[PDB]
Design an enzyme around this catalytic site. Structure first.
Site, PDB file in Angstrom:
ATOM      1  N   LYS A   1      -8.335 -10.367  -3.708  1.00 23.72           N
ATOM      2  CA  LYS A   1      -8.857  -9.310  -2.846  1.00 23.72           C
ATOM      3  C   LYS A   1     -10.380  -9.291  -2.850  1.00 23.72           C
ATOM      4  O   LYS A   1     -11.004  -8.996  -1.825  1.00 23.72           O
ATOM      5  CB  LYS A   1      -8.309  -7.952  -3.286  1.00 23.72           C
ATOM      6  CG  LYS A   1      -6.955  -7.598  -2.696  1.00 23.72           C
ATOM      7  CD  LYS A   1      -7.083  -7.043  -1.287  1.00 23.72           C
ATOM      8  CE  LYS A   1      -5.722  -6.662  -0.723  1.00 23.72           C
ATOM      9  NZ  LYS A   1      -4.945  -7.854  -0.279  1.00 23.72           N
TER      10      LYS A   1
ATOM     11  N   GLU B   1      -4.832   4.330   4.786  1.00 21.11           N
ATOM     12  CA  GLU B   1      -3.515   3.722   4.914  1.00 21.11           C
ATOM     13  C   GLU B   1      -2.504   4.751   5.408  1.00 21.11           C
ATOM     14  O   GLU B   1      -2.616   5.948   5.134  1.00 21.11           O
ATOM     15  CB  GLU B   1      -3.069   3.139   3.571  1.00 21.11           C
ATOM     16  CG  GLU B   1      -1.759   2.362   3.614  1.00 21.11           C
ATOM     17  CD  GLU B   1      -1.836   1.132   4.498  1.00 21.11           C
ATOM     18  OE1 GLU B   1      -2.889   0.461   4.496  1.00 21.11           O
ATOM     19  OE2 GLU B   1      -0.842   0.836   5.194  1.00 21.11           O
TER      20      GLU B   1
ATOM     21  N   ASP C   1      -7.920   1.324   2.146  1.00 19.65           N
ATOM     22  CA  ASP C   1      -6.814   2.259   1.977  1.00 19.65           C
ATOM     23  C   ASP C   1      -7.263   3.708   1.868  1.00 19.65           C
ATOM     24  O   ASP C   1      -6.595   4.598   2.403  1.00 19.65           O
ATOM     25  CB  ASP C   1      -5.997   1.888   0.735  1.00 19.65           C
ATOM     26  CG  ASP C   1      -5.260   0.575   0.894  1.00 19.65           C
ATOM     27  OD1 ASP C   1      -4.597   0.387   1.936  1.00 19.65           O
ATOM     28  OD2 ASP C   1      -5.344  -0.272  -0.021  1.00 19.65           O
TER      29      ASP C   1
HETATM   30  C1  LIG Z   1      -0.346  -8.238   7.863  1.00 16.84           C
HETATM   31  O1  LIG Z   1       0.423  -7.535   6.926  1.00 16.84           O
HETATM   32  C2  LIG Z   1       0.511  -6.159   7.175  1.00 16.84           C
HETATM   33  C3  LIG Z   1      -0.642  -5.416   7.379  1.00 16.84           C
HETATM   34  C4  LIG Z   1      -0.554  -4.054   7.625  1.00 16.84           C
HETATM   35  C5  LIG Z   1      -1.822  -3.230   7.856  1.00 16.84           C
HETATM   36  C6  LIG Z   1      -2.084  -2.217   6.745  1.00 16.84           C
HETATM   37  N1  LIG Z   1      -1.675  -2.758   5.467  1.00 16.84           N
HETATM   38  C7  LIG Z   1      -2.685  -3.225   4.543  1.00 16.84           C
HETATM   39  O2  LIG Z   1      -3.831  -3.167   4.833  1.00 16.84           O
HETATM   40  C8  LIG Z   1      -2.256  -3.795   3.200  1.00 16.84           C
HETATM   41  N2  LIG Z   1      -1.131  -4.710   3.147  1.00 16.84           N
HETATM   42  C9  LIG Z   1      -0.694  -5.276   1.847  1.00 16.84           C
HETATM   43  C10 LIG Z   1       0.489  -6.238   1.790  1.00 16.84           C
HETATM   44  C11 LIG Z   1       0.315  -7.580   2.084  1.00 16.84           C
HETATM   45  C12 LIG Z   1       1.397  -8.445   2.030  1.00 16.84           C
HETATM   46  C13 LIG Z   1       2.651  -7.966   1.681  1.00 16.84           C
HETATM   47  C14 LIG Z   1       2.824  -6.623   1.388  1.00 16.84           C
HETATM   48  C15 LIG Z   1       1.743  -5.760   1.443  1.00 16.84           C
HETATM   49  C16 LIG Z   1       1.929  -4.280   1.120  1.00 16.84           C
HETATM   50  N3  LIG Z   1      -1.404  -4.902   0.597  1.00 16.84           N
HETATM   51  C17 LIG Z   1      -2.527  -3.985   0.647  1.00 16.84           C
HETATM   52  O3  LIG Z   1      -3.086  -3.695  -0.352  1.00 16.84           O
HETATM   53  C18 LIG Z   1      -2.971  -3.414   1.950  1.00 16.84           C
HETATM   54  O4  LIG Z   1      -4.057  -2.528   2.000  1.00 16.84           O
HETATM   55  C19 LIG Z   1       0.686  -3.435   7.664  1.00 16.84           C
HETATM   56  C20 LIG Z   1       1.838  -4.177   7.456  1.00 16.84           C
HETATM   57  C21 LIG Z   1       1.751  -5.539   7.212  1.00 16.84           C
HETATM   58  O5  LIG Z   1       2.914  -6.287   7.004  1.00 16.84           O
HETATM   59 MN   LIG Z   2      -4.178  -2.034  -0.107  1.00 14.09          MN
HETATM   60 MN   LIG Z   3      -4.167  -1.117   3.570  1.00 11.79          MN
END
Ligand SMILES: COc1cc(CCNC(=O)c2nc(-c3ccccc3C)[nH]c(=O)c2O)ccc1O
Ligand SMILES: [Mn+2]
Ligand SMILES: [Mn+2]
Ligand SMILES: C[C@H](C[C@@H](C[C@H](C[C@@H](C[C@@H](CCN1CCCC1=O)N1CCCC1=O)N1CCCC1=O)N1CCCC1=O)N1CCCC1=O)N1CCCC1=O
Length: 183
Positions: free
Chosen positions: A122, A68, A96
């Site tokens: 998840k 991440e 992550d």
């Molecule tokens: C399409 O949504 C997004 C995807 C990304 C790619 C990397 N992010 C994740 O993979 C990731 N996202 C979340 C997340 C999901 C919804 C609201 C807030 C959160 C915090 N929860 C995780 O645990 C995680 O691993 C970046 C921004 C985005 O808005």
């Molecule tokens: Mn995550």
């Molecule tokens: Mn992530």
């Protein structure tokens, strides 16, 4: 249609470290979202980002590989390198972290609901049984796959305390209710 600032945005810029704010901005813009309107998702992306970095800060020096916070193309490049080096199955969804000590990827989750609902959410998405799941909540609870919480208790308690501090700071600004009922 894009504003010059909201209460949630100014709080996020005051609550989180500037490098956390910049990476969350880059993450949302990469996925076509603007932190200035999607301010609840802005706070959640920052929170998930800080938890991921506090998590990797626990344990040994070379224990974790941070997935991440990187751009999607480079994050998948490191994932392929890890899979092609250790032999672990390539996950369908970008995780992550990777635990060089436990030889598994980690999916970090931060929820405003019961940790039971998010983990089951998840887990049904993760498929790849090898991907370890570790959920944190803003109330102080946590769930991990196989009850294997990876890190020490002190490192996890530090993460829970930070999550509850973010909750109190949001509530004192009357921002917590809209933040909880938006996940
Ligand atoms: C399409 O949504 C997004 C995807 C990304 C790619 C990397 N992010 C994740 O993979 C990731 N996202 C979340 C997340 C999901 C919804 C609201 C807030 C959160 C915090 N929860 C995780 O645990 C995680 O691993 C970046 C921004 C985005 O808005
Ligand atoms: Mn995550
Ligand atoms: Mn992530
Ligand atoms: C490596 C570099 C940035 C890192 C981000 C991450 C932040 C880390 C910094 C530590 C020190 N502390 C602790 C005190 C304040 C501070 O600053 N923590 C952890 C706690 C909060 C925080 O801030 N780490 C870890 C390695 C050194 C570093 O800085 N990232 C971003 C995603 C991938 C990654 O490894 N990279 C890598 C390429 C792009 C980039 O920017």
């Amino acid at each position: 249609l894009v504003p010059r600032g909201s209460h949630m945005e100014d709080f996020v810029r005051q609550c989180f470290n500037p490098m956390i704010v910049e990476l969350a901005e880059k993450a949302m813009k990469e996925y076509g979202e603007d932190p200035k309107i999607e301010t609840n998702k802005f706070a959640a992306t920052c929170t998930h980002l800080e938890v991921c970095f506090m998590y990797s800060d626990g344990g040994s020096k070379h224990r974790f590989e941070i997935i991440e916070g990187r751009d999607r193309i480079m994050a998948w490049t490191v994932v392929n390198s890890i899979c092609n080096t250790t032999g672990v199955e390539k996950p369908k969804f970008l995780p992550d972290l990777y635990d060089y000590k436990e030889n598994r990827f980690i999916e970090i989750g931060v929820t405003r609901r019961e940790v039971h609902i998010y983990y089951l959410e998840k887990a049904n998405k993760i498929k790849s049984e090898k991907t370890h799941i570790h959920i944190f909540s803003f109330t102080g609870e946590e769930m991990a796959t196989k009850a294997d919480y990876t890190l020490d208790e002190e490192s996890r308690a530090r993460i829970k305390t930070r999550l509850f501090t973010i909750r109190q700071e949001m509530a004192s600004r009357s921002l917590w209710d809209s933040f909880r009922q938006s996940e």
